Amino acid sequence: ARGPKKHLKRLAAPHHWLLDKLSGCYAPRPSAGPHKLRESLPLIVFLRNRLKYALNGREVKAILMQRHVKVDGKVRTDTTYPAGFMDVITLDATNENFRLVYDVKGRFAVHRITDEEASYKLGKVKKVQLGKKGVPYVVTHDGRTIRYPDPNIKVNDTVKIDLASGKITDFIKFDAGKLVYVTGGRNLGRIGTIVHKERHDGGFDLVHIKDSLDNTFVTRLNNVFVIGEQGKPYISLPKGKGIKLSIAEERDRRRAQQGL
Amino acid sequence: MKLNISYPVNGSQKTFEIDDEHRIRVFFDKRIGQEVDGEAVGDEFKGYVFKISGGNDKQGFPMKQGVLLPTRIKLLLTKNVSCYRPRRDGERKRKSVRGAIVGPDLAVLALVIVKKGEQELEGLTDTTVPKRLGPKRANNIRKFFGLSKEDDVRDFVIRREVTKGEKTYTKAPKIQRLVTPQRLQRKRHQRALKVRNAQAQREAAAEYAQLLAKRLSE
Amino acid sequence: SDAVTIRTRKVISNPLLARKQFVVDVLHPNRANVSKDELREKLAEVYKAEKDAVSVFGFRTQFGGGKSVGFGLVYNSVAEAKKFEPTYRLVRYGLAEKVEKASRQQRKQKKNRDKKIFGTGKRLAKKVARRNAD
RNA sequence: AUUCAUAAUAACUUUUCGAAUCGCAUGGCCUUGUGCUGGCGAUGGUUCAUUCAAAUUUCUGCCCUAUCAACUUUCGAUGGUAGGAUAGUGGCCUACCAUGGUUUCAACGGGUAACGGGGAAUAAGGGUUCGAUUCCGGAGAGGGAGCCUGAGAAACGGCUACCA
RNA sequence: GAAACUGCGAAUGGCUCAUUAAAUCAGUUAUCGUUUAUUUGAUAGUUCCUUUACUACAUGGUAUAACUGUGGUAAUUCUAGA
């Protein structure tokens, strides 16, 4: 096409933004960044399509010009920034400490955290590599890069890096028993266990998972995201917990929790 | 034709109307940049000598240096070359143009005086036209007033007074390349940060090696 | 003109814009209408503005009438309102002056005309004026 | 899973890079220079990674036609060796060598009033017809070829030649 | 703060569907077969010289527009000299 696309149409946007068919032709086209745009969420969306603190991109960009935001400990003023999973976002003037994570519906759940735990996030490890000068370095799901880690970290693990210094802290491996978040697909948002792994060398290893309800479900390895140990979340969890109700049970909860 | 001559020492420029066939013929067969003594062309110009600079044809098409064969021609063109303003970058374009060479197809021709003759040329030689700017860079000022490395040019600078309707005020340029305590602070920042970060990375690698030593100890 | 049960629903405090944003629900049962400026007055009268930090704009009436619904804002600092809110509402409220600018195609024609003239112009000018003189 | 990552060694380089750049600020300490230090943020820059992409690419899949049964290698058709060229693999191209490759499980050719798909209509089921057109992908900017710029174009509301 | 120089972009978008019959295209792979402006994260003590009478580093140089004014052309997003 003689070049990349600086545009995005509505009805091509991610369905998990809960936008409308209508209100125009075009849509925000997330900028470059750590989070892949289908995997991501814009600032305007978190605000204007999840918070309703504002209406228009005018108001949004005005707010960002006021520098009202940090993101993982840093301001970012692009309306089309690609926010995403396990981000940390904090507001000062309202003193809101958020963290980005899906619903069990796979929708980027509004999970408010405290001032602490807006002091730590996780990074699942994409690759660890013997960088040059013999240096070891390693990168994360959220587009960062660190050197001199703990070497016992290995691929597919996660780590509790701190936030702003960087600075890996104690971390979590991948073996039987651990606790997990799901980051893609039909089981998206779900939470469970390691119960076994179906290693398929050459490609597409899978992981059998079991939620608290002994609902088993098996997923792609790459969508795996360790989050602590079983009965031991290293973070704060939203509502729903990746427990994956039936629509029947959901209905039941609607009509029941409705009333009084 | 008409003749457009400059006296660069004054900054003067002046046009004349030269319709004597015989005096005009003195320039045929010549090219740009050749020198010619205008004594044949006027006792007023006796002793004067001029270097051929340029000319336009009877339809406005110009000449150019090294573009021979005294006629009109289309050439493809680029940036950093006269007779053409490239409009968007990369653009290369064809245009017509007249030859380098003197010929009767030139309503106008333009020169610059090389050497002054005996006479004076009133409108051009008499008037002394001023240069529009002075130096701007500090080193330019330094050469311009014969200043040392130390001489503190700041006061030497030119200023231009300007009246409001009554309120007069001076205006002057803004020195670039000037050394300042800020620039010194900047290099200070840079140097300090460089060696600091180096030693930071050094000790980090040290801790890493320590851990590694324990791993083999175990 | 019997009375008005105006109500303010869905109240949010917005420190990152320094405003209170809510939904106006008017029960104006046998009047006709709404009249935003009257609303402006009652709304500074019930939260606090000194009217002009309050903005209101989606005030459609129910089928049959007697009720209208819109959105309402009350900002902190009328100056802050005057910097954040857009100018068409300020002119609607008389709190600003709508600029008298030219039509789009006139501006465009002008741009396309000036798309030819390299540079200052006034030296294009002294020579087009001389050559035109003769 | 690698001649990977990376390191080290000996040399090479019309020598790449390593900040002569810009805005807010003003601090300290004396050996009192204008000393030496010293914050905030702005833009740039090597490599790596990421992101946005792009390019090639595996497998399966298409309407009619045998009144197209043979096709493919003049001049690369299939493959090998080496080389160039490319961002880069590759007959992509060039050299030498081979004689292979496809085909009734329909090739090759021809037609299509053929851009494909998402889908639309029709309604038992099974199906039939259409789908240029609000999304995705692809091609084109009167027809063709070439090309600079630029990370990215064979651009066309950019250029060059021809044809109309 | 006109104007211009510099920088970026103008290759997106929008329009149409002529071509195109394993070709595009759908789904599905792959790059241990490649490039990647931008965004983001990190990333730079060594740059000199037969190594005492050394070499702007408190920073080194021109070459040009914008500008001047000389002008040209039936005519243009034409442009010449100084």
Swiss-Prot record, chain A:
Any Gene Ontology CC annotation: cytosol
Swiss-Prot/TrEMBL keywords: Cytoplasm, Isopeptide bond, Phosphoprotein, Ribonucleoprotein, Ribosomal protein, RNA-binding, rRNA-binding, Ubl conjugation
First-listed, main subcellular location of the protein, grouped into a coarse class: cytoplasm
Cross-link for Glycyl lysine isopeptide (Lys-Gly) (interchain with G-Cter in ubiquitin), residue positions: K61, K133, K160, K167, K173, K178, K210, K232
Entry keyword RNA-binding: yes
Modified residues (Phosphothreonine): T114
PROSITE patterns registered for this protein in UniProt: RIBOSOMAL_S4E, S4
GO biological process, one term: translation
Span of domain S4 RNA-binding: 41-104
Phosphoserine carried by residues: S31, S246
Compartments in which it is found: Cytoplasm
Function: Component of the ribosome, a large ribonucleoprotein complex responsible for the synthesis of proteins in the cell. The small ribosomal subunit (SSU) binds messenger RNAs (mRNAs) and translates the encoded message by selecting cognate aminoacyl-transfer RNA (tRNA) molecules. The large subunit (LSU) contains the ribosomal catalytic site termed the peptidyl transferase center (PTC), which catalyzes the formation of peptide bonds, thereby polymerizing the amino acids delivered by tRNAs into a polypeptide chain.
Subunit structure and binding partners: Component of the small ribosomal subunit (SSU). Mature yeast ribosomes consist of a small (40S) and a large (60S) subunit. The 40S small subunit contains 1 molecule of ribosomal RNA (18S rRNA) and 33 different proteins (encoded by 57 genes). The large 60S subunit contains 3 rRNA molecules (25S, 5.8S and 5S rRNA) and 46 different proteins (encoded by 81 genes).
Anything else known: Present with 573 molecules/cell in log phase SD medium. There are 2 genes for eS4 in yeast.
Protein name (Swiss-Prot/TrEMBL): Small ribosomal subunit protein eS4A
Lineage of the species this protein comes from: Eukaryota, Fungi, Dikarya, Ascomycota, Saccharomycotina
From Swiss-Prot, chain B:
Assigned keywords, A-Z: Cytoplasm, Isopeptide bond, Nucleus, Phosphoprotein, Ribonucleoprotein, Ribosomal protein, Ribosome biogenesis, rRNA processing, Ubl conjugation
Gene Ontology MF, one: structural constituent of ribosome
Gene3D superfamilies: 1.20.5.2650
Modified residues (Phosphothreonine): T163
Primary location class: cytoplasm
Family: Belongs to the eukaryotic ribosomal protein eS6 family.
Function description: Component of the ribosome, a large ribonucleoprotein complex responsible for the synthesis of proteins in the cell. The small ribosomal subunit (SSU) binds messenger RNAs (mRNAs) and translates the encoded message by selecting cognate aminoacyl-transfer RNA (tRNA) molecules. The large subunit (LSU) contains the ribosomal catalytic site termed the peptidyl transferase center (PTC), which catalyzes the formation of peptide bonds, thereby polymerizing the amino acids delivered by tRNAs into a polypeptide chain.
PANTHER family assigned to the protein according to its UniProt record, in alphabetical order: 40S RIBOSOMAL PROTEIN S6
Gene Ontology biological process: maturation of SSU-rRNA from tricistronic rRNA transcript (SSU-rRNA, 5.8S rRNA, LSU-rRNA); translation
Organism this protein belongs to: Saccharomyces cerevisiae (strain ATCC 204508 / S288c)
Pfam families assigned: Ribosomal_S6e
Location in chain, cross-link Glycyl lysine isopeptide (Lys-Gly) (interchain with G-Cter in ubiquitin): K116, K131, K149, K214
General remark: Present with 66000 molecules/cell in log phase SD medium. There are 2 genes for eS6 in yeast.
Gene Ontology cellular-component annotations: 90S preribosome; cytosol; cytosolic small ribosomal subunit; nucleolus; nucleoplasm; small-subunit processome
Subcellular location, record wording: Cytoplasm; Nucleus, Nucleolus
InterPro entries given in the database record: Ribosomal_eS6, Ribosomal_eS6-like, Ribosomal_eS6_CS
Designated name of the protein: Small ribosomal subunit protein eS6A
PROSITE patterns: RIBOSOMAL_S6E
UniProtKB/Swiss-Prot annotation, chain C:
Keyword field contains Ribonucleoprotein: yes
MF (Gene Ontology): structural constituent of ribosome
GO cellular component: cytosol; cytosolic small ribosomal subunit; mitochondrion
InterPro entries: eRP_eS24_sf (IPR053709), Ribosomal_eS24 (IPR001976), Ribosomal_eS24_CS (IPR018098), Ribosomal_uL23/eL15/eS24_sf (IPR012678)
Key words of the record: Acetylation, Cytoplasm, Isopeptide bond, Phosphoprotein, Ribonucleoprotein, Ribosomal protein, Ubl conjugation
Main location: cytoplasm
UniProt subcellular location: Cytoplasm
Covalent cross-link Glycyl lysine isopeptide (Lys-Gly) (interchain with G-Cter in ubiquitin), where: K20
PTM description: N-terminally acetylated by acetyltransferase NatA. Also partially acetylated by NatC.
Modified residues (N-acetylserine): S1
UniProt biased composition (Basic residues): 104-114, 123-134
Region annotated Disordered, chain positions: 101-134
Highest rank taxon of the organism: Eukaryota
Residues recorded as bearing Phosphoserine in the entry: S13, S55
One GO BP: cytoplasmic translation
Family per similarity comment: Belongs to the eukaryotic ribosomal protein eS24 family.
Role description: Component of the ribosome, a large ribonucleoprotein complex responsible for the synthesis of proteins in the cell. The small ribosomal subunit (SSU) binds messenger RNAs (mRNAs) and translates the encoded message by selecting cognate aminoacyl-transfer RNA (tRNA) molecules. The large subunit (LSU) contains the ribosomal catalytic site termed the peptidyl transferase center (PTC), which catalyzes the formation of peptide bonds, thereby polymerizing the amino acids delivered by tRNAs into a polypeptide chain.
Oligomeric and partner information: Component of the small ribosomal subunit (SSU). Mature yeast ribosomes consist of a small (40S) and a large (60S) subunit. The 40S small subunit contains 1 molecule of ribosomal RNA (18S rRNA) and 33 different proteins (encoded by 57 genes). The large 60S subunit contains 3 rRNA molecules (25S, 5.8S and 5S rRNA) and 46 different proteins (encoded by 81 genes).
Additional record remark: There are 2 genes for eS24 in yeast.
Name the UniProt record assigns to this protein: Small ribosomal subunit protein eS24A
Natural source organism: Saccharomyces cerevisiae (strain ATCC 204508 / S288c) (Baker's yeast)
Gene encoding the protein: RPS24A
